[PDB]
Design a binder for this molecule. Sequence first.
Ligand SMILES: Nc1ncnc2c1ncn2[C@@H]1O[C@H](COP(=O)(O)OP(=O)(O)OP(=O)(O)O)[C@@H](O)[C@H]1O
Ligand SMILES: Nc1ncnc2c1ncn2[C@@H]1O[C@H](COP(=O)(O)OP(=O)(O)OP(=O)(O)O)[C@@H](O)[C@H]1O
Ligand SMILES: Nc1ncnc2c1ncn2[C@@H]1O[C@H](COP(=O)(O)OP(=O)(O)OP(=O)(O)O)[C@@H](O)[C@H]1O
Ligand SMILES: [Cl-]
Ligand SMILES: [Cl-]
Ligand SMILES: [Cl-]
Ligand SMILES: [Mg+2]
Ligand SMILES: [Mg+2]
Ligand SMILES: [Mg+2]
Lengths: 113, 113, 113
Amino acid sequence: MKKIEAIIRPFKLDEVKIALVNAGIVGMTVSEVRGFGRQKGQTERYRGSEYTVEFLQKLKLEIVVEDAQVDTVIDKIVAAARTGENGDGKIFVSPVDQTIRIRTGEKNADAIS
Amino acid sequence: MKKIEAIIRPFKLDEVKIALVNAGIVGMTVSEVRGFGRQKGQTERYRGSEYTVEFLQKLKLEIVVEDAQVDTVIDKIVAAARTGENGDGKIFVSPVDQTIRIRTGEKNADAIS
Amino acid sequence: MKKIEAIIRPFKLDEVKIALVNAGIVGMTVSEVRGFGRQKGQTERYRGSEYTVEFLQKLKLEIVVEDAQVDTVIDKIVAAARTGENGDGKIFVSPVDQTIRIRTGEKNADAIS
Ligand SMILES: Nc1ncnc2c1ncn2[C@@H]1O[C@H](COP(=O)(O)OP(=O)(O)OP(=O)(O)O)[C@@H](O)[C@H]1O
Ligand SMILES: Nc1ncnc2c1ncn2[C@@H]1O[C@H](COP(=O)(O)OP(=O)(O)OP(=O)(O)O)[C@@H](O)[C@H]1O
Ligand SMILES: Nc1ncnc2c1ncn2[C@@H]1O[C@H](COP(=O)(O)OP(=O)(O)OP(=O)(O)O)[C@@H](O)[C@H]1O
Ligand SMILES: [Cl-]
Ligand SMILES: [Cl-]
Ligand SMILES: [Cl-]
Ligand SMILES: [Mg+2]
Ligand SMILES: [Mg+2]
Ligand SMILES: [Mg+2]
């Protein structure tokens, strides 16, 4: 099992969300964050101004899936979230040792099906 | 060391929190999130309406503990957070390689005691 | 690759942020959380009152770096965030299996450079 954490542009939420639902994702969590991602020598454009290290609003998507579904999920997010301008986002994949469904106590594969 | 991340119903915060404090948990983090968890063919009830993939408000609890305490923490959350209606929540356990207490620089077991 | 998650006092954001930018960090994410950290028998001071398990506002910083940069990042956060009063914060380091830059599809070391 893996956790996929994707930082995306806020306006992209709808476009990304539809891609994931159509791909068969059945659970996801979203939160509001702020961030910077300043590659060397670049500025990020937002509403007609250029930024270096100021924090900009982003959204964090969290999706826990079976290992065999990670690449599909990654591909769907990338294709829907990208624009070609710096600031499009970043995805981090991390291990999940156990998953538990609260209502039933189901575990692991059963809790993500 | 493990991180326990629990997504719960917002109203349950107090009921869950009291269970964990009584069990001896000494540190926890809470954040506001939104989410869906649509098992196939189901709808989630909220304030008299039925939802499919709309995002609903949830809370994310994060608790870092020693390995030997994980199952106790899981049990306390499940028992306090559940209601029997879909939407009760989900728990993800993940590895923590190092913990550092900022004030003192204490590490690992010392930083979670 | 590792994720560094640091819970800090909200007022410290600026002091911590400047330390990390000067150390060469190029990406970070911040979120608003609440928390308690009650070591046995202690109270946390906030705006002239003493707290046990009430939730206090904190900030969560998330920084994904190469393994060889973790200790530098940890040191910079600790030195900038600390005050000597309980409630200064806690840092959790966890594994990241894959990183993807959304705009380009670059992976891993390429996505964090
Ligand atoms: N290494 C990192 N650790 C934590 N958060 C990061 C990191 N890099 C980026 N982020 C988060 O992702 C957001 C988007 O980053 P961004 O798209 O600018 O990445 P980038 O590597 O600079 O790529 P690009 O060249 O496309 O801008 C940031 O604002 C921040 O919230
Ligand atoms: N696989 C997942 N990845 C990330 N977040 C998830 C996932 N599944 C659920 N969540 C989060 O947990 C919340 C509660 O999920 P929920 O209780 O609906 O899970 P479920 O598996 O559908 O179980 P139930 O049948 O009890 O509804 C969601 O709204 C979402 O925030
Ligand atoms: N084990 C933990 N799991 C999750 N979050 C924690 C944990 N311990 C602390 N936190 C988070 O970090 C914040 C700061 O904790 P705090 O500085 O009080 O830690 P502490 O171990 O009690 O150290 P101190 O003695 O310096 O107070 C908390 O309010 C909470 O948000
Ligand atoms: Cl493009
Ligand atoms: Cl029931
Ligand atoms: Cl001091
Ligand atoms: Mg960038
Ligand atoms: Mg559900
Ligand atoms: Mg404390």
